Amino acid sequence: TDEEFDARWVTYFNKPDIDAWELRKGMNTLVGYDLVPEPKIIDAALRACRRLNDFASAVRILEVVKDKAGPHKEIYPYVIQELRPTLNELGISTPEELGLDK
Amino acid sequence: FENRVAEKQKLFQEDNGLPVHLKGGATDNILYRVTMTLCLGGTLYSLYCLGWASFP
């Protein structure tokens, strides 16, 4: 089920001592699927980036969420809406806020 | 006859840098030169024959 898939990926990124290899393996695996990851999954991955002192990877994860949506323009702004409290809490600037959307 | 395979093993394993087709000694060189001379000479003769046969 969708709920069980999402729960497993939240658990994966929530492991306190997740290492850099596991963060990369998780994101590189997840973006192979026919889906844009749920905000709860991205929230967990962004907090992993914080535990790993990796600001750049947090920005890259927001870029690949936008990318996975393809022409479905409504997905990225919905995701950023849902992540706003976490972005504010962790001081994560969006790619747009950084000019990296060119 | 006596089993002289060990003596041939020693000859063909000698660290002399020779490829296996020349490792038996001077007779290998002679047989190689006869073979290659007949092959190359024969091939040149086949081309001459082609030249002859290409015209009435």
């Binding site: 695996t29 973006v31 192979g32 699927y33 026919d34 990318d67 996975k68 393809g70 022409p71 | -």
Partner: protein, 227 residues
């Protein structure tokens, strides 16, 4: 005969060529559709930023990919084989004519009743009468009765040739030591052209076939005149 800028078959002169035209129309519609589907699907696969790069399960889709092509092939083969068995069906011919291939001309033998035989050579371009067709005319045409079942027997006195008349649906190899049979029936009078259709050496391009289809009464008058 063919005409300039022709895309398809010569107009059918025999019932079996008519059948072949209808069967080709059916088959070409399938060829077009499958060609077009493959091109369309290529374009569909190549026109999205959406991705799915993880392992995909193939089992379900391979049922569609084998069953649907099997059905299509059956739908081609059924009418194909119906025509094959029609073109073999026992007919009672009223006439047998032999043709022998040679390097490079045809001979014809009408030996049902009289020993009539003659040779049939291409008219050289320098000898064509005004309005006659380059590489297609012969000196002696194959005079035959229209609207009658004719048995053609085909052989060769030298190398392989092949006796063809596209508008009648005919092509039978001419093999020395072998007597190959085909059936000819023209729905119409007129002149019907074909060309040698097995490479037989330097003048393969230059040993055509010309049938002259006339009413039975005129065929009989022609036969009687030949005595």
């Amino acid at each position: 005969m063919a005409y300039p800028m022709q895309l398809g078959f010569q107009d059918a002169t025999s019932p079996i060529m008519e059948e072949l035209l209808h069967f080709h129309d059916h088959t070409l519609m399938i060829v077009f559709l499958i060609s077009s589907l493959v091109l369309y699907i290529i374009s569909l696969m190549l026109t999205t930023k959406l991705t799915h790069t993880s392992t995909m399960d193939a089992q379900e889709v391979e049922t569609i990919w084998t069953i649907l092509p099997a059905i299509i092939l059956i739908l081609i083969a059924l009418p194909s084989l119906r025509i094959l068995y029609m073109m073999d069906e026992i007919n009672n011919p009223s006439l047998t004519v032999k043709t022998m291939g040679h390097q490079w001309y045809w001979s014809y033998e009408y030996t049902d009743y009289e020993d009539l035989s003659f040779d049939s050579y291409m008219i050289p371009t320098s000898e064509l009468k005004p309005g006659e067709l380059r590489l297609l005319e012969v000196d002696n045409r194959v005079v035959l009765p229209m609207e009658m079942t004719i048995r053609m027997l085909v052989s060769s006195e030298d190398v392989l040739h092949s006796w063809a008349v596209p508008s009648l649906g005919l092509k039978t190899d001419a093999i020395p030591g072998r007597l190959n049979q085909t059936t000819l029936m023209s729905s119409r009078p007129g002149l019907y052209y074909g060309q040698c259709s097995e490479i037989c050496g330097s003048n393969h391009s230059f040993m055509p076939i010309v049938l002259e289809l006339v009413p039975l009464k005129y065929f009989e008058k022609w036969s009687a005149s030949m005595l």
